[PDB]
Each structure stands twice: as structure tokens, then as C-alpha cells.
Design a binder for these strands. Structure first.
Length: 133
DNA sequence: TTTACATGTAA
DNA sequence: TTTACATGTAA
């Protein structure tokens, strides 16, 4: 095919393959991280060219608010505040980050970790604390 | 009310 | 310098 030489879009190859929206795509080959075509599509539409928002929508696709609130972001170091906070799932985080650094080669590791920490930080400012003494 | 991005801290 | 973090801001 006349298309092999091209760099191509920096997205999931099957993403635009006309197919079942509920089909589970492996986000990055050999990571065992899956997402539905429809949901990955939804992440890309929402983000457009904003790699920062693409990171945020992918992370919210795997991690709900309570998981985010109880996580220390990437966990390169342990938490400053609450040592019971576990890192966000390391296998999911690497695949998501690898997928976004591949979607936007100027995205740096440290910007990506800073966004992941902010997700958790936002989840904690929203989660309502207990009203017990 | 929520959150993407900004600001600046503590260790 | 780095990184998890709470908070400020704008929409």
C-alpha cells in the first residue's frame, strides 16, 4: 500500500477502522490495557489536538473520582500527605502515557506526571469529606 | 459546582 | 532540582 511509508496519524491504528464501538482495543501493544473503540474515540474528539486534555480524558476513562482521590498520582515518590495513598495503576499509567507521548512527541514525562497528580488533587477537592466526628 | 491550567510549597 | 500536593483562577 501507498500508505506504509507515511508517519500516519499518531493514534490507535484500529481506531478509525469502521467496526463495533464496543470492541475492546489494546491501547498499547503488549500492555494488557484495554478500552472500547467508542470510549477512545470519545477521548480523541474531546481533546482534538490538545494532548493535555487527551491525557486527562484517558485517565478518567480508567480511574473514577474515588480511585483518583485515594491515589498519589504516578507515585514516583510516595505521598507527602497520606502514606496510605497508592500510586495509580502503574501498568495503566505507563500505557496511557506511552500512548500520549506517542500522540504528541513534545509532551514530556514531567508534564504528564504533573497532570496525573492534578487529577488526584482535583478529585480530593471535590470528594465530600465525612460528616462524622 | 466542577475542572483545565496556573501558582507556589515541602522535603 | 524534583514531585505530590493544596489552592487560586476562569469559564
Amino acid at each position: 500500500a501507498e500508505l506504509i511509508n507515511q508517519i500516519g496519524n499518531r493514534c490507535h491504528p484500529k481506531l478509525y477502522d469502521e467496526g463495533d464501538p464496543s470492541e475492546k482495543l489494546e491501547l498499547v501493544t503488549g500492555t494488557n490495557v484495554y478500552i472500547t473503540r467508542a470510549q477512545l474515540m470519545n477521548c480523541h474528539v474531546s481533546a482534538g489536538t490538545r494532548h493535555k486534555v487527551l491525557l486527562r480524558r484517558l485517565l478518567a476513562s480508567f480511574f473514577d473520582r474515588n480511585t483518583l482521590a485515594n491515589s498519589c498520582g504516578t507515585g514516583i515518590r510516595s505521598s507527602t500527605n497520606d502514606p496510605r495513598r497508592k500510586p495509580l495503576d502503574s501498568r495503566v499509567l505507563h500505557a496511557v502515557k506511552y500512548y500520549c507521548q506517542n500522540f504528541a512527541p513534545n509532551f514530556k514525562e514531567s508534564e504528564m506526571n504533573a497532570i496525573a497528580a492534578d487529577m488526584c488533587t482535583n478529585a480530593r477537592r471535590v470528594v465530600r469529606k465525612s460528616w462524622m466526628p
